[PDB]
Amino acid sequence: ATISNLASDIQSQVDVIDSYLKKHNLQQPSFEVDSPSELPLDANVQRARLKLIETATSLANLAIGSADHLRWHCMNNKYDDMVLHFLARYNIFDAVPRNESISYVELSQKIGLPEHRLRRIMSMAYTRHLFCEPKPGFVAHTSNSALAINDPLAMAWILHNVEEVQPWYANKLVDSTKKWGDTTDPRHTGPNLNAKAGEEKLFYQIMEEDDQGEWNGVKGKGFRLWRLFDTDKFFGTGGAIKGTNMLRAFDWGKLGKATVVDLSGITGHLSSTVALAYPDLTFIVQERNQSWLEKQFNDKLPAELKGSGRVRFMAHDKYAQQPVKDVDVFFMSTMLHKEPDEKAITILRHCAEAMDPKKSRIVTRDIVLDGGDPPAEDALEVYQAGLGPTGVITRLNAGIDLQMLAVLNAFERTREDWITLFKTADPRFVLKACIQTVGDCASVMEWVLEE
CB of 142 to ligand F56, least distance (A): 24
CB of 203 to ligand F56, least distance (A): 7
235 binds ligand F56 (CB under 6 A): yes
The partner residues of 446 in beta bridges, in order of sequence, read 363, 433
Site string for a copy of itself, 21-60 (x = CB under 8 A): -------xxxx---xxxxx---------x--xx--xxxxx
From 90, 244, 205, 241, select the one nearest 155 (Cα to Cα). 90
CB of 413 to a copy of itself, least distance (A): 12
From 300, 228, 243, 242, select the one nearest 37 (Cα to Cα). 242
Q: By C-beta, is 44 or 144 nearer to a copy of itself?
A: 144
369 binds ligand F56 (CB under 6 A): no
Distance of alpha carbon 437 from alpha carbon 385, whole angstroms: 11
Could you say which of ligand F56, a copy of itself, none residue 4 binds, taking C-beta under 5 to 8 angstroms by partner kind? a copy of itself
Q: How many helices (H) and strands (E) does the chain have?
A: 17, 11
Of 180-188, 224-232, 261-269, 318-326, the segment contacting ligand F56 by CB under 6 A is: 224-232
403 binds a copy of itself (CB under 8 A): yes
CB of 78 to a copy of itself, least distance (A): 5
Indicate the DSSP class of residue 373: B
Distance of alpha carbon 320 from alpha carbon 389, whole angstroms: 40
Distances (CA, A) of 154 to 36, 148, 344: 18, 6, 29
Query: Pairing state of beta strands 138-139 and 218-219?
Result: unpaired
The answer to whether the CB of 332 falls within 8 A of the CB of 268 is no
Q: Which residue has the closest beta carbon to ligand F56?
A: 403
Report CA 236 to chain centroid distance, whole Å: 7
215 binds ligand F56 (CB under 6 A): no
Site string for ligand F56, 237-266 (x = CB under 6 A): ----x-------------------------
232 binds ligand F56 (CB under 6 A): yes
407 binds ligand F56 (CB under 6 A): yes
From 407, 415, 404, select the one nearest 367 (Cα to Cα). 415
Q: Which of 78, 257, 306, 432 binds a copy of itself (CB under 8 A)?
A: 78
Q: By C-beta, is 25 or 77 nearer to a copy of itself?
A: 77
CB of 430 to ligand F56, least distance (A): 23
CB of 440 to ligand F56, least distance (A): 9
From 428, 420, 427, select the one nearest 451 (Cα to Cα). 428
Residues in 99-128 at the binding interface with a copy of itself, rule: CB under 8 A: 113-114, 116-117, 120-121, 123-124, 126-128
Compute φ and ψ for 107, nearest 5 degrees.
-65, -45
Residues in 330-349 at the binding interface with ligand F56, rule: CB under 6 A: 334, 337-338
Angle, alpha carbons 276-280-281 (nearest 5°): 75
CB of 165 to a copy of itself, least distance (A): 8
204 binds a copy of itself (CB under 8 A): no
Q: By C-beta, is 113 or 266 nearer to ligand F56?
A: 266
Q: By C-beta, is 130 or 336 nearer to ligand F56?
A: 336
Q: How much is the CA Rg of the chain, to the nearest whole Å? A: 23
Q: Which residues contact 376 (CB under 8 A, 6 or more apart)?
A: none
Distance of alpha carbon 226 from alpha carbon 292, whole angstroms: 9
Q: By C-beta, is 106 or 401 nearer to ligand F56?
A: 401
Residues in 305-344 at the binding interface with a copy of itself, rule: CB under 8 A: none
Type of residue numbered 327: V
403 binds ligand F56 (CB under 6 A): yes
Q: Which of 92, 95, 107, 146 binds a copy of itself (CB under 8 A)?
A: 146
From 25, 2, 50, 441, select the one nearest 240 (Cα to Cα). 441
The partner residues of 369 in beta bridges, in order of sequence, read none
400 binds ligand F56 (CB under 6 A): yes
Buried residues in 139-154 as b, exposed as e (16+ CB within 10 A): bbbbbbbbbbeebbbb
Q: Which of 68, 326, 353, 416 binds a copy of itself (CB under 8 A)?
A: 68
CB of 302 to a copy of itself, least distance (A): 20
The answer to whether the CB of 306 falls within 8 A of the CB of 298 is yes
Report the interface residues with ligand F56, using CB under 6 A: 228, 231-232, 235, 241, 334, 337-338, 367, 400, 403, 407, 442
